[PDB]
């Protein structure tokens, strides 16, 4: 090209290839890292909240990691403003699935329902593209614990370790590298989660004001999802902290 034929999504690209999506991917990198690691009794999500400021009202512990359903939770990397419509939408879909199927909703099914809305916005209706990558964490009895990655465009993939945010390229390779398979436990995936989160992020300290950590753990055959509170979060950070400290001068 030499000029876009976009300026609306009710008019389209001078190549028919959508530039806006590549700027959206860059948008996840602007925002803080989101990572998901797999465990053999749970799955956990670790995300960097928008708020770093000391003054926090703290009525919410969920401000980027939202528990949607009685089987699944998701996280946001990107603009916070976008999650609010999405999170309420996800709640509707998630319970919608239960009504008909009444099964521990699989991660692949929830993500495909959402991808229908994101692909339409980019095609028509004059709505601006999304700028969030969401990580869905859940349990089904047919493959186990799963992690899925959704992109602004509607592009999806099942992972068991994936990271986006604070330069995606580096982060996904690193998360993989430190990940091990079938050697894991929930406490050690959590200790590791802070460590990797620390390296991708500029900070070498990190606090529960900066970070918000969620578990999804299966107990007595049913999935209990909680986003953890600050004192509990701090304990995972301090566990990591001794190691981080030795790296430093």
């Amino acid at each position: 090209m030499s000029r876009r034929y976009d300026s609306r999504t009710t008019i389209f690209s001078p190549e028919g290839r959508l530039y806006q999506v590549e700027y959206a991917m860059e948008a996840i990198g602007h925002a803080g890292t989101c990572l998901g690691i797999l465990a053999n009794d749970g799955v956990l999500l670790a995300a960097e909240r928008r708020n770093i400021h000391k003054l926090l009202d703290e009525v919410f512990f969920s401000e980027k990691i939202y528990k949607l359903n009685e089987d699944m939770a998701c996280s946001v990397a990107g603009i916070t403003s976008d999650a609010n419509v999405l999170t309420n939408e996800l709640r509707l879909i998630a319970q919608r699935y239960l009504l008909q199927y009444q099964e521990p909703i699989p991660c692949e099914q929830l993500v495909t329902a959402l991808c229908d809305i994101k692909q339409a916005y980019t095609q028509f209706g004059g709505k601006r593209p999304f700028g969030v990558s969401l990580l869905y964490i859940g349990w089904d009895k047919h493959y186990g614990f799963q992690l899925y990655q959704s992109d602004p465009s509607g592009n999806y993939g099942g992972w068991k370790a994936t990271c986006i945010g604070n330069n995606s390229a580096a982060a996904v390779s690193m998360l993989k590298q430190d990940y091990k398979e079938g050697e894991m436990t929930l406490k050690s995936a959590l200790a590791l989660a802070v460590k990797v989160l620390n390296k991708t992020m500029d900070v070498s300290k990190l606090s529960a004001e900066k970070v918000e950590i969620a578990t999804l753990t299966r107990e007595n055959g049913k999935t209990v999802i909680r986003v953890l509170k600050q004192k509990e979060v701090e304990q995972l950070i301090k566990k990591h902290e001794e190691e981080e400290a030795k790296a430093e001068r």
């Binding site: 190549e15 095609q123 465009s153 509607g154």
Partner: protein, 246 residues
Amino acid sequence: MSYDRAITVFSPDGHLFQVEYAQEAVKKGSTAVGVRGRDIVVLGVEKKSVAKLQDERTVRKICALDDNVCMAFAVVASVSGLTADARIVINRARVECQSHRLTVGDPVTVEYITRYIASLKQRYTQSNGRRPFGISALIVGFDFDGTPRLYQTDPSGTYHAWKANAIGRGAKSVREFLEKNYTDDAIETDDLTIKLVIKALLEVVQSGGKNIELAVMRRDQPLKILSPEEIEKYVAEIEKEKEENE
């Protein structure tokens, strides 16, 4: 806003901008070849975009829309390995196919879904705000009649049947390549039908035959995806014969 920028402007080219441009995307990412056989019409894909930690069950580059019609695609655009655009098209085309069964019975014909899909992209050119899908699908199947068909759709939405047709990684290149391999013998024999697919894929070979996924589909019967392990058996032997021609 400018005249050129707008979705309405039929352009000196003599054809609408957004329809033209979608047509210039049917090379690069993924590769889909389909050849026609008596007993199986077979499609094969190379590149499901899998790191082999990524689920291969999630990414469908070979999806059965009916119980005797299946399709494999490829396409060009921004951001690699892009599941989304292809995935909406699978969802509307597959439901419509099941709805067709309900209205007017038995497995729906190859040619009808292909007519529906070509028109689906076309209607969009009238519709508000909507450009056509840049996708070419190699609709592979058997009719209820059992008459094997191999159909291909294009981004404007004109469709033609072929005996054998290949797209992606340069559409024109793979079409030309496939024409040397195709013979009337190839269609009659059950071993050769698979090899004909694989033979077009290999001129942009990446990562084994485990990367390459093939399906055979029969007259009224569901998609049978041959193991990622079986495919490898054909590739080792054939790949040597391949080097010689180009």
